[PDB]
Design a protein around this nucleic acid. Structure first.
Lengths: 275, 187, 49, 115
RNA sequence: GAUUAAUAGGGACAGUCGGGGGCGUCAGUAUUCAAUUGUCAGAGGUGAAAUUCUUGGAUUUAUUGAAGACUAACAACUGCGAAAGCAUUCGCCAAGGAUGUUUUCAUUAAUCAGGAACG
C-alpha cells in the first residue's frame, strides 16, 4: 500500500528500486500523474551523489513516456535527462528502450541522431547500430556502409580503427543476417594491414573456433586448420604465443575428435620447437 | 584600373608618411599611382593605363602588405626586384605554450642577432621578427630553406645544428664532383 | 545568518556538481566552501550554537 | 571583347597555367613546367613559364578570347601564401604576348584552422 | 546586564567585469574521403633525386555529400583562472574578481608538522 511505501521510503529515501516499486504500484493503480509525482519526488529527495539511482528513476520515467506517454512528454524528459545526466547514456538507454518496445523507425531516427552527435568519440554507438542492422532491420549492406561512415567519422588510431573493425566483424560472425564470410573479409583486411598483431590473430582464432555459422551453429574445421597453418607460418612469433597457439589447436582438435589431426598438431609443434 | 588596399596603424603611419615620397616615386617609375589616407589609415594603389609591366600590380600589393608588416623602406622597395618576394610564417599557432613560445622565439633571435645575421648571409635572405609572425625575403631557395629553419627552431632543434647543416649544404653544393647523392651521411 | 548563506551557496554548488560531476574547478570551489563551513561552524559552535 | 578565366598554380617546384571557361567548368587549355622544359629542377623556372605562357596564349588566341581576368593561387593549405616566379614571369609573358586584361584577383585558399 | 567598530574579518544586496569553468547550440574555413563533369602528359619530391600516382586520367578546374580538427588577420609591455592553462554565434548552470552601500556575529585572525584536490 501507499502508506507501506511511504514508511519504507522514510526508512530508505535514496532507494531507487523502492521508488520504482512505488510508482509501479501507481502504474498498477493507473495513476500516471501520481507516478510522475513520485518520480519527481525521487529526483528531488534522492541525494546528490547517487547517480545510478538517479539514472534508474530517469530511465524508468522514459519507459513511462514511451509506453503510456506521448511524443512531447518523451522529448521534454529526454531533454531534461540529458540536461541533468550524460547525454550519450540517456540516448543509448532510449535506444535500447526503442529496441525493446519495437518502435524501430523512431529508433532509427534516434540512431542517426546519436551517430551524428556522439559517433565522434563513442565506437560503441556504431557497434549497437550495426547490431540493430544485422538484426531486425536486416540491411547488412547498410551496416557495412555505416562502417565506412564510421571510418570517416573517427580517426585512425589503434583503439578506434582496429577495435571497431573487429567488433563489426564479430557482429558479422554472430548474426545469421551478418555473413561470417563478410566477417572473414573484415578479419583478412585486418591481418593484411597489420600482420604483426598476434592478439588480433588470436581473436580471429577464437571467433572461428566459436559459433561462426549461427544459422546452424558449428565451426568449420577445414578453414580452422588452414588459418591455424597460416598462424604457424606468419613471421614474428614469440615461443610463448607459439606454444599457446599449438595448445589452442590441440584443444580444438580434441573437441573435434580427429586424433590424426591431433598427432599432426603434436608433430608440427615438435618441428616448430626445433629451431 | 584595379586596386589593392589594406589598413595600417598610427604608430606605423608616421614612418609611412616620412618614407612615402621614396615609395610613390618608385611606383611612379613603375608607372603606378599610389595614395595614402590619414583619417582612416589606408594606402590605395591603382594600375594606370601607362603601366608598361603587368606584374606591377601584384608586386605593389606585396609591397604595401610589407609596409603594413612594418619592414624598413629600403628593403620594402628592394622587393621590386624580379626574384625578390616575401613569405609569412605564423608561429603562435605552432607553439601552444606561452613561455615556451617566448623562449623559442628568443632562441631564434640568438645572442645579439648573430644567429639571424648568419642565417641572412647563409641564405642571402632578410629576416624580421614581428611577434607571432615571421616576415622574410630573398631568393626562393633561401625562402624554402628559411621556412624549414623557422619550423625546426619552433621544433626546438638548435640553430647551431641548423647553421652547421647549411654550411655543409653550401660546401657540398659548391664542390662539383659530389653533385648528386643523398648527402645525409655528411649531415 | 552568515553560516546560513554559506551553506546555501554550498548546497547550490553541490547540486551543480550533481548536474555535472566533471567540473573539477567547481569541485575545488566546493572544497574551499566546505573548508570555510568547517572553520566558521566550529568558531560559532564554540560560542554555544 | 571576349573574356575568360586563366587560373595559375605556381609553386616553387612546379608551375601550372590552366585556363578554364568564364564559369570555370570547361577546361580550355592546360600546360605545365614538364610539358615545358621537363627538367625536374627547372620544372619551376621563369623560362619554362615563358614557354608555357606562350603556348596557352597562342592556343587561347587561336580560340579567340583575347582578354582574361587572372586567378592566382599557391599552396594555401599548409605552406606559403606566396606564389611562384612562374606566376610572375607568366603574367609578364602573357600581357607581353599581348592580350589586354580587365581586373586581376588572386584567390588563395586560406585556412582558419591550420593547426 | 552588551567597548572602540579594525586603516584584518566573512557575508548580504545593486550596477558591473572576465579569450574563468562545465554543458548544449550557431558558424567559419581548411584537410581527408566519395561522387560528378572539363580534363589529357606528366604530376610529385628534392639542394639535385628517388619512392609514389599516373590514357581506368593522376596533378589540375568546378559543384555537391560525409568526416574530424582548430578558430587566422583583430591578438596586446593586455584580460581571466591558484596552476596546468584560456580565444566562432547563442543560450543555460552555478561559482570568481573589482566597485559601491543608509549591511550585519564581533574574534572569528595569520602561519604551516600529519594529511587531502587538481598536471
Amino acid at each position: 500500500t501507499a502508506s507501506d511505501f511511504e514508511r519504507l521510503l522514510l526508512g530508505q529515501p535514496d532507494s531507487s528500486e523502492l521508488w520504482i516499486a512505488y510508482m509501479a504500484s501507481q502504474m498498477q493503480v493507473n495513476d500516471l500523474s501520481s507516478a510522475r509525482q513520485i518520480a519527481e519526488r525521487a529526483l528531488k529527495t534522492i541525494n546528490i551523489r547517487e547517480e545510478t539511482e538517479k539514472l534508474n528513476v530517469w530511465i524508468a520515467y522514459l519507459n513511462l513516456e514511451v509506453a503510456y506517454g506521448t511524443d512531447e512528454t518523451v522529448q521534454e524528459v529526454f531533454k531534461r535527462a540529458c540536461t541533468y545526466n550524460d547525454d550519450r547514456e540517456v540516448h543509448e538507454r532510449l535506444a535500447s528502450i526503442y529496441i525493446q518496445s519495437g518502435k524501430y523507425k523512431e529508433a532509427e531516427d534516434l540512431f542517426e541522431k546519436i551517430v551524428k552527435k556522439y559517433g565522434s568519440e563513442a565506437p560503441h554507438v556504431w557497434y549497437n547500430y550495426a547490431h540493430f542492422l544485422h538484426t531486425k532491420s536486416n540491411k547488412p549492406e547498410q551496416a557495412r556502409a555505416l562502417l565506412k561512415r564510421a571510418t570517416q567519422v573517427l580517426g585512425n588510431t589503434k583503439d578506434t580503427y582496429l577495435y571497431l573493425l573487429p567488433k563489426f566483424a564479430a557482429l558479422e560472425f554472430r548474426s545469421p543476417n551478418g555473413d561470417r564470410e563478410q566477417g572473414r573479409t573484415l578479419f583478412e583486411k585486418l591481418l593484411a594491414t597489420y600482420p604483426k598483431r598476434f592478439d588480433l590473430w588470436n581473436q580471429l582464432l577464437d571467433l572461428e573456433t566459436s559459433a561462426s555459422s549461427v544459422a546452424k551453429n558449428p565451426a568449420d574445421p577445414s578453414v580452422i586448420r588452414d588459418l591455424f597453418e597460416r598462424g604457424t607460418k606468419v613471421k614474428g612469433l614469440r615461443p610463448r604465443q607459439a606454444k599457446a597457439w599449438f595448445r589452442r589447436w590441440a584443444q580444438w582438435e580434441e573437441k573435434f575428435g580427429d586424433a590424426k589431426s591431433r598427432e599432426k598438431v603434436s608433430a608440427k609443434a615438435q618441428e616448430w620447437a626445433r629451431a | 584600373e584595379s586596386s589593392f588596399m589594406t589598413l595600417f596603424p598610427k604608430y606605423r603611419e608616421r614612418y609611412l608618411k616620412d618614407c612615402w615620397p621614396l615609395v610613390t616615386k618608385a611606383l611612379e617609375k613603375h608607372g603606378i599611382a599610389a595614395t595614402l589616407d590619414i583619417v582612416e589609415g589606408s594606402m590605395t594603389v591603382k594600375t594606370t593605363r601607362k603601366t608598361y609591366d603587368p606584374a606591377a600590380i601584384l608586386k605593389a600589393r606585396d609591397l604595401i602588405k610589407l609596409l603594413a608588416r612594418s619592414v624598413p623602406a629600403p628593403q620594402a622597395l628592394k622587393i621590386l626586384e624580379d626574384g625578390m618576394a616575401c613569405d609569412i610564417i605564423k608561429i603562435r599557432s605552432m607553439v601552444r605554450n606561452k613561455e615556451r613560445f617566448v623562449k623559442r622565439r628568443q632562441r631564434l633571435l640568438g645572442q645579439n642577432g648573430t644567429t639571424l645575421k648568419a642565417l641572412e648571409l647563409l641564405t642571402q635572405t632578410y629576416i624580421l621578427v614581428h611577434g607571432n609572425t615571421v616576415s622574410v625575403m630573398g631568393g626562393y631557395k633561401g625562402l624554402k630553406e628559411v621556412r624549414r629553419v623557422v619550423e625546426d627552431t619552433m621544433n626546438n632543434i638548435h640553430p647551431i645544428y641548423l647553421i652547421k647543416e647549411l654550411m655543409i649544404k653550401r660546401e657540398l653544393a659548391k664542390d662539383p664532383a659530389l653533385a648528386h647523392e643523398d648527402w645525409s651521411r655528411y649531415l | 545568518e552568515d553560516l546560513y548563506f554559506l551553506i546555501k551557496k554550498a548546497v547550490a554548488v553541490r547540486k551543480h556538481l550533481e548536474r555535472n560531476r566533471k567540473d573539477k574547478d567547481s569541485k575545488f570551489r566546493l572544497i574551499l566552501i566546505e573548508s570555510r563551513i568547517h572553520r566558521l561552524a566550529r568558531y560559532y559552535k564554540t560560542v554555544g550554537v | 571583347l571576349v573574356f575568360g578565366v586563366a587560373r595559375i598554380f605556381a609553386s616553387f617546384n612546379d608551375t601550372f597555367v590552366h585556363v578554364t571557361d568564364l564559369s570555370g567548368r570547361e577546361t580550355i587549355c592546360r600546360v605545365t613546367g614538364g610539358m615545358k622544359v621537363k627538367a625536374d629542377r627547372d620544372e619551376s623556372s621563369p623560362y619554362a613559364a615563358m614557354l608555357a605562357a606562350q603556348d596557352v596564349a597562342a592556343r587561347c588566341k587561336e580560340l579567340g578570347i583575347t582578354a582574361l581576368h587572372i586567378k592566382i593561387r599557391a599552396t594555401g593549405g599548409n605552406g606559403t601564401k606566396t606564389p611562384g616566379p612562374g606566376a610572375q614571369s607568366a603574367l609578364r609573358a602573357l600581357a607581353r604576348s599581348g592580350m589586354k586584361i580587365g581586373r586581376i584577383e588572386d584567390v588563395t585558399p586560406t585556412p582558419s584552422d591550420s593547426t
